[PDB]
Amino acid sequence: GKLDALRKVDVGAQVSGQLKTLSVAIGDKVKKDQLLGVIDPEQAENQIKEVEATLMELRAQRQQAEAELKLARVTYSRQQRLAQTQAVSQQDLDNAATEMAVKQAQIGTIDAQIKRNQASLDTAKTNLDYTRIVAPMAGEVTQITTLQGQTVIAAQQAPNILTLADMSAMLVKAQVSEADVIHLKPGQKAWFTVLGDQLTRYEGQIKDVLPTPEKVNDAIFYYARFEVPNPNGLLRLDMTAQVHIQLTDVKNVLTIPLSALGDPVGDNRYKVKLLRNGETREREVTIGARNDTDVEIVKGLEAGDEVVIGEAKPGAAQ
Amino acid sequence: GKLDALRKVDVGAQVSGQLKTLSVAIGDKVKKDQLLGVIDPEQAENQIKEVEATLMELRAQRQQAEAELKLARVTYSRQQRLAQTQAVSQQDLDNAATEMAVKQAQIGTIDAQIKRNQASLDTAKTNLDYTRIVAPMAGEVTQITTLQGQTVIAAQQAPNILTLADMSAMLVKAQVSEADVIHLKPGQKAWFTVLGDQLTRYEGQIKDVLPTPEKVNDAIFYYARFEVPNPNGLLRLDMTAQVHIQLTDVKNVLTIPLSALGDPV
Instruction: Report the sign of the C-alpha dihedral through residues A128, A134, A136, A142, in that order.
Output: positive
- Which DSSP symbol is given to A159? P
Is the separation of the CB atoms in A211 and B237 below 8 Å? yes
State the Cα–Cα distance between residues A150 and A147, nearest whole angstrom. 6
Of the partner residues A9, A136, A211, the one whose CB lies closest to the CB of residue B27: A211
All residues of chain A having their beta carbon less than 8 Å from the beta carbon of residue B47 are 123
Residue contact B57–A116, C-beta within 8 A: yes
Residue contact A156–B155, C-beta within 8 A: yes
A12 CB near a chain B CB, below 8 Å?
A: yes
All residues of chain B having their beta carbon less than 8 Å from the beta carbon of residue A222 are 236
Is the separation of the CB atoms in A144 and A162 below 8 Å? yes
State the Cα–Cα distance between residues B15 and B41, nearest whole angstrom. 10
State the Cα–Cα distance between residues A140 and A90, nearest whole angstrom. 81
Bridge-based pairing of strands A281-284 and B2-11 is unpaired
For B95, the 3-state DSSP assignment is: helix
Is the separation of the CB atoms in A129 and A59 below 8 Å? no
Of the partner residues A12, A182, A210, the one whose CB lies closest to the CB of residue B150: A12
Question: Pick from A94, A101, A66, A70: which is nearest to A80 by CA?
Answer: A94
State the Cα–Cα distance between residues B40 and B21, nearest whole angstrom. 9
Is the separation of the CB atoms in B54 and A113 below 8 Å? no
Residues in A 146-205 with any Cβ partner in B closer than 8 A: 154-159, 178-182
All residues of chain B having their beta carbon less than 8 Å from the beta carbon of residue A134 are none
A131 CB near a chain B CB, below 8 Å?
A: no
Looking at the complex, report in whole angstroms how far the Cα of residue B146 sits from the nearest Cα belonging to chain A. 9
Residues in B 34-53 with any Cβ partner in A closer than 8 A: 42-43, 46-47, 49-50, 53
Bridge partners for A229 per DSSP: A169
CA nearest to A135 within chain B: B149
Of the partner residues A116, A157, A182, the one whose CB lies closest to the CB of residue B153: A157
Within 10 A of A11 (CB to CB), how many other CB atoms are there? 23
| Concatenated DSSP letters of A51-117 | HHHHHHHHHHHHHHHHHHHHHHHHHHHHHHHHHTT--STTHHHHHHHHHHHHHHHHHHHHHHHHHHH
Method: cryo-EM
All residues of chain B having their beta carbon less than 8 Å from the beta carbon of residue A127 are none
B247 CB near a chain A CB, below 8 Å?
A: no
Which run of H or of E encompasses A203? strand A202-204
Q: For residue A55, count CB atoms less than 10 angstroms from its CB and return exposed for 0-12, middle for 13-18, buried for 19 or more.
A: middle
CA nearest to B48 within chain A: A119
Helix extents (H) in B84-231: 91-131
Which run of H or of E encompasses A172? strand A169-173
State the Cα–Cα distance between residues B186 and B211, nearest whole angstrom. 13
- Which DSSP symbol is given to B9? E
Chains A, B: CB contacts under 8 A, how many? 132
Of the partner residues A7, A113, A156, the one whose CB lies closest to the CB of residue B156: A156
Of the partner residues B49, B151, B239, the one whose CB lies closest to the CB of residue A178: B239
Listed in order, strand segments (DSSP E) in chain B are 2-11, 19-22, 29-30, 35-39, 132-134, 139-144, 162-173, 176-177, 190-194, 202-204, 214-216, 218-222, 228-229, 241-245
All residues of chain B having their beta carbon less than 8 Å from the beta carbon of residue A220 are 238-240
State the Cα–Cα distance between residues A142 and A145, nearest whole angstrom. 10
State the Cα–Cα distance between residues B153 and A157, nearest whole angstrom. 6
Within 10 A of A218 (CB to CB), how many other CB atoms are there? 5
B142 CB near a chain A CB, below 8 Å?
A: yes
State the Cα–Cα distance between residues A89 and B82, nearest whole angstrom. 15
User: Best interface-test mutation with A: which of B151, B153, B198, B242 has the largest number of A CBs within 10 A?
Assistant: B151
- Phi, psi angles (nearest 5°) of residue B71: -65, -50
Category of B27 on φ-ψ map: left (φ > 0), alpha (ψ -120 to 50) or beta: left
Residue contact B143–A215, C-beta within 8 A: no
| Concatenated DSSP letters of A213-281 | ---BSBS-EE-EE--EE--TT---TT--EEEEE------S--EEETTT----TTT--EEEE--TTS--E
For residue B26, CA distances in Å to A204, B93, B137 come to 21, 78, 15
B92 CB near a chain A CB, below 8 Å?
A: no
State the Cα–Cα distance between residues A47 and A126, nearest whole angstrom. 11
State the Cα–Cα distance between residues A98 and A93, nearest whole angstrom. 8
Which run of H or of E encompasses A36? strand A35-39
